[PDB]
DNA sequence: CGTATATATACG
DNA sequence: CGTATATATACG
């Protein structure tokens, strides 16, 4: 197909293995945000790897923002350390990449209207509610948002390879719905 | 901006 | 389910 999705976000989780005290953390980490009313975790953000993290009282933590398996893993480590230095046994157990998002450009318009039809069991398209065809591919289990211009977003991946597979699968199909 | 997608955390 | 988080993408 000659094209390559560029990763755009990676959501990963990890376990610090020690019940945290969020208010404490909220008060001292400073670049934090916290309001157990709206959600039960302290949002915290670093500048490199530029990320954001939801810190949980349970020790568990989610990391979002990254653009590569590693940038995420690193940011995961640095937030782990940040809590470490604030006064708690920050271990780094069970790291795992929960979601990965990617995007690319087929380089041509697509008549969503037909794809929807010839592929109804896979597609969804209510252009007034949202302008993109939600293509829930099955192998690999990747949901793609296909748009009029040819911009495509693959999502719900646990491994970079799923995104590459997914695209390669959807490409020829897309290439066959070139807007007139 | 709200719409809309995947995905883990949490939880009453 | 509400509520929170990131990201490309495009609309009214």
UniProtKB/Swiss-Prot annotation:
Q: Where in the cell is it found?
A: Nucleus
Q: What are its GO biological-process terms?
A: DNA-templated transcription initiation; mRNA transcription by RNA polymerase II; positive regulation of transcription initiation by RNA polymerase II; RNA polymerase II preinitiation complex assembly; spermatogenesis; transcription by RNA polymerase II; transcription by RNA polymerase III; transcription initiation at RNA polymerase II promoter
Naming one, the record's GO cellular component terms include:
transcription factor TFIID complex
Q: Which UniProt keywords apply?
A: Disease variant, DNA-binding, Host-virus interaction, Neurodegeneration, Nucleus, Repeat, Spinocerebellar ataxia, Transcription, Transcription regulation
**Which stretches are sequence repeats?**
7-83, 97-174
Residues where DNA binds: 9, 45, 60, 99, 136
A molecular function GO annotation: RNA polymerase I core promoter sequence-specific DNA binding
Report where it is expressed, by tissue.
Answer: Widely expressed, with levels highest in the testis and ovary.
Keyword hit for Transcription regulation:
yes
Going by the entry's taxonomy, the superkingdom of the source organism is recorded as Eukaryota
Q: How does it assemble?
A: Binds DNA as monomer. Component of the TFIID basal transcription factor complex, composed of TATA-box-binding protein TBP, and a number of TBP-associated factors (TAFs), including TAF1, TAF2, TAF3, TAF4, TAF5, TAF6, TAF7, TAF8, TAF9, TAF10, TAF11, TAF12 and TAF13. Part of a TFIID-containing RNA polymerase II pre-initiation complex that is composed of TBP and at least GTF2A1, GTF2A2, GTF2E1, GTF2E2, GTF2F1, GTF2H2, GTF2H3, GTF2H4, GTF2H5, GTF2B, TCEA1, ERCC2, ERCC3, TAF1, TAF2, TAF3, TAF4, TAF5, TAF6, TAF7, TAF8, TAF9, TAF10, TAF11, TAF12 and TAF13. (Microbial infection) Interacts with HIV-1 Tat.
The UniProt function text for this chain reads: The TFIID basal transcription factor complex plays a major role in the initiation of RNA polymerase II (Pol II)-dependent transcription. TFIID recognizes and binds promoters with or without a TATA box via its subunit TBP, a TATA-box-binding protein, and promotes assembly of the pre-initiation complex (PIC). The TFIID complex consists of TBP and TBP-associated factors (TAFs), including TAF1, TAF2, TAF3, TAF4, TAF5, TAF6, TAF7, TAF8, TAF9, TAF10, TAF11, TAF12 and TAF13. The TFIID complex structure can be divided into 3 modules TFIID-A, TFIID-B, and TFIID-C.
User: Can you tell me which family this protein belongs to?
Assistant: Belongs to the TBP family.
Q: Which disorder is it associated with? A: Spinocerebellar ataxia 17: Spinocerebellar ataxia is a clinically and genetically heterogeneous group of cerebellar disorders. Patients show progressive incoordination of gait and often poor coordination of hands, speech and eye movements, due to degeneration of the cerebellum with variable involvement of the brainstem and spinal cord. SCA17 is an autosomal dominant cerebellar ataxia (ADCA) characterized by widespread cerebral and cerebellar atrophy, dementia and extrapyramidal signs. The molecular defect in SCA17 is the expansion of a CAG repeat in the coding region of TBP.
Annotated protein name in UniProt: TATA-box-binding protein
Q: Which organism is it from?
A: Homo sapiens
Q: Which residues of the full protein are shown?
A: 159 to 338 of 339
């Amino acid at each position: 197909s000659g094209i390559v999705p560029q990763l755009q976000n990676i959501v990963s989780t990890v376990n610090l293995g020690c019940k945290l005290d969020l208010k404490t953390i909220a008060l001292r980490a400073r670049n934090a945000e916290y309001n157990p009313k709206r959600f039960a975790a302290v949002i915290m953000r670093i500048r490199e790897p530029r990320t954001t993290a939801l810190i949980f009282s349970s020790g568990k933590m989610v990391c979002t923002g990254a653009k590569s398996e590693e940038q995420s893993r690193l940011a995961a480590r640095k937030y782990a350390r940040v809590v470490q230095k604030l006064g708690f046994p920050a271990k780094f157990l069970d790291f795992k990449i929960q979601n990965m998002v990617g995007s690319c450009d087929v380089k041509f318009p697509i008549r969503l209207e037909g794809l929807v039809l010839t592929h109804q069991q896979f597609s969804s398209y209510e252009p007034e509610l949202f302008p993109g065809l939600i293509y829930r591919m099955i192998k690999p289990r990747i949901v793609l948002l296909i748009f009029v211009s040819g911009k495509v977003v693959l999502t719900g991946a646990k491994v970079r390879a799923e995104i590459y597979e997914a695209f390669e699968n959807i490409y020829p199909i897309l290439k066959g719905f070139r807007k007139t």
